[PDB]
Amino acid sequence: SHPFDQAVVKDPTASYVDVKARRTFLQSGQLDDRLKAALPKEYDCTTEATPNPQQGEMVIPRRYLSGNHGPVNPDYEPVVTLYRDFEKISATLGNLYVATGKPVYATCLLNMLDKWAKADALLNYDPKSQSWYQVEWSAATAAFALSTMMAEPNVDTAQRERVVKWLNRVARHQTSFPGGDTSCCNNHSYWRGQEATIIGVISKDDELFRWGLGRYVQAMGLINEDGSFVHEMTRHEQSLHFQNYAMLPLTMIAETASRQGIDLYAYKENGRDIHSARKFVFAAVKNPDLIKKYASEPQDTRAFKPGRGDLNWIEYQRARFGFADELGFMTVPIFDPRTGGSATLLAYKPQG
Numbered sequence: 001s002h003p004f005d006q007a008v009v010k011d012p013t014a015s016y017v018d019v020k021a022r023r024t025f026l027q028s029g030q031l032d033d034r035l036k037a038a039l040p041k042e043y044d045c046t047t048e049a050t051p052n053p054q055q056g057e058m059v060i061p062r063r064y065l066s067g068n069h070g071p072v073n074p075d076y077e078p079v080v081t082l083y084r085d086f087e088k089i090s091a092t093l094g095n096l097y098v099a100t101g102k103p104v105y106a107t108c109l110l111n112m113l114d115k116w117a118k119a120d121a122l123l124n125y126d127p128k129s130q131s132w133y134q135v136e137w138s139a140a141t142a143a144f145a146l147s148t149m150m151a152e153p154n155v156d157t158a159q160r161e162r163v164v165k166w167l168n169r170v171a172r173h174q175t176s177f178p179g180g181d182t183s184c185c186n187n188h189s190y191w192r193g194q195e196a197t198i199i200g201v202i203s204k205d206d207e208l209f210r211w212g213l214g215r216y217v218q219a220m221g222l223i224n225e226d227g228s229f230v231h232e233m234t235r236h237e238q239s240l241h242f243q244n245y246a247m248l249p250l251t252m253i254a255e256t257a258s259r260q261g262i263d264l265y266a267y268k269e270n271g272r273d274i275h276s277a278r279k280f281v282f283a284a285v286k287n288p289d290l291i292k293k294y295a296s297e298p299q300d301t302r303a304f305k306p307g308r309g310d311l312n313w314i315e316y317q318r319a320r321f322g323f324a325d326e327l328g329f330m331t332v333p334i335f336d337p338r339t340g341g342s343a344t345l346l347a348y349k350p351q352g
């Protein structure tokens with residue numbers, strides 16, 4: 001199938017960032033204003049009311065009024081709010097655990113997840129509905145936060161175990177569906193890939209892990225000569241948006257895999273790799289004529305402004321590669337639950 005089909009999970013506690021080293025850095029290192037701005041605010045999470053899971057069938061309206069672009073369905077947002085709160089709190093607690101090392105944040109995360117697990121949340125839905133997508137985002141969000149505390153001894157370990165098993169079932173069920181002519185292969189495929197990768201790690205499920213790495217391999221084969229993703233260039237006014245969107249899960253799969261000794265960044269297909277796609281995002285934002293080759297609509301550029309969660313992937317890549325912030329977007333801190341919370345907090349290092 002692919003070059004990583006014998007890969008195994010070596011360390012289920014390794015997470016998607018070196019938690020101990022990063023914490024040490026946050027507590028002893030010379031922080032700039034940006035990093036200080038990114039420190040999460042402590043609070044007493046033991047008294048906080050967290051979202052309750054939906055009873056029974058997960059029903060979520062379609063996102064787009066019609067098609068896969070244009071105006072948004074007015075019924076969508078009020079419904080996915082519950083999920084976005086679940087995501088926000090999760091990622092916030094994970095980041096607080098990393099920054100402070102206090103077990104209380106871990107216990108808070110586990111109590112919320114345990115409640116969702118006991119309800120069999122994220123399991124009952126129509127695979128052809130919007131719900132199937134919502135699961136890929138919410139399950140990865142939770143897993144990323146949980147992955148940072150897999151080594152913590154001061155928690156209810158039995159509860160930690162039920163939650164991991166639940167996540168494993170969620171991801172196995174969610175990724176068992178192939179998708180359509182697009183969702184088999186487009187950014188959704190990559191999002192399922194990040195889900196399978198991180199949950200495969202924390203649950204020591206080699207097969208889920210391999211399936212997730214396979215999604216990254218699939219993506220590299222769908223990059224045009226210019227660095228554009230084939231399926232993202234069919235989205236009309238959201239083409240540029242979706243080109244960027246695709247980078248989010250691809251980057252987390254690569255970051256997660258590097259903690260298990262795999263270097264997905266180095267992987268390429270016919271001389272094309274993730275760096276080509278980065279270069280194209282940067283170029284096309286400076287010069288949107290580039291997109292005209294694929295779409296004639298004026299591009300929606302809501303994702304391209306300082307502080308947008310959509311830019312979180314830049315935090316991880318620039319930490320690792322050292323390239324230049326050519327668009328001048330890395331000013332304020334970035335926070336995105338679906339890619340592990342604040343990549344500023346977790347990856348960004350000030351530069352001499």
Ligand SMILES: O=C(O)C1=C[C@H](O)[C@H](O)[C@H](O[C@H]2[C@H](O)[C@H](O)[C@H](O[C@H]3[C@H](O)[C@H](O)[C@H](O[C@H]4[C@H](O)[C@H](O)[C@H](O)O[C@@H]4C(=O)O)O[C@@H]3C(=O)O)O[C@@H]2C(=O)O)O1
Binds near residue numbers: 063186187302309310
């Ligand atoms: O990050 C911010 O700073 C931020 C500020 C704004 O106030 C607002 O909160 C904004 O919200 C984001 C939200 O955080 C998610 O990122 C949301 O994500 C979208 C994503 O942009 C795509 O539109 C995605 O598209 C799907 C679609 O849902 C269907 O599944 C379709 O069939 O396939 C596509 C696809 O190919 O992926 O849906 C996501 C979603 O609905 O969660 O976007 C909002 C936002 O409005 O930008 O962030």
